[PDB]
Structure 1
Amino acid sequence: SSTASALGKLQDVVNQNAQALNTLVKQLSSNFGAISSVLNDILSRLDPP
């Protein structure tokens, strides 16, 4: 009841999973060498070639 920080394993697993998912969704905004990082605008501002 009094002392915390005894359940480290479960908390670490949850933190690792959340970190992996969060960085995966973070990777969505990177330029990756294109001119813009959004599909809709780059489709609505250019021609197919």
Structure 2
Amino acid sequence: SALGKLQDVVNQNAQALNTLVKQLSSNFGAISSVLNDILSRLDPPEAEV
């Protein structure tokens, strides 16, 4: 654990990127987290919402 100061920085950036990428799996109230499924299933009046 001697080089913890540098490893902590690497870990914080890795966690930040992993968190950002994992947010793409969230629905945020939408019917699906996948944009392609929404566009494949819905027409613009509902798809835009």
- TM bin, normalised by shorter chain, reads 0.7 to 0.9
**Whole-angstrom CA distance in 2 between matches of 1:6 and 1:48:** 57
For the residue of structure 1 that corresponds to 2:22, the secondary structure is helix
Higher helix share: 2
Aligned sequence identity (%)? 100
Return 5+ residue gaps in structure 1 as ranges. none
Give the TM-score normalised by the residue count of structure 2.
0.83
- For 1:1-49, what per-residue CA distance to the aligned partner results, in whole angstroms no more than 9, with x for missing partners? xxxx111100111011101011000111101001111111111111111
Give the TM-score normalised by the residue count of structure 1.
0.83
The alignment yields a C-alpha RMSD, in angstroms, of 0.7
Return 5+ residue gaps in structure 2 as ranges. none
**Equivalences, count:** 45
Larger radius of gyration: 1
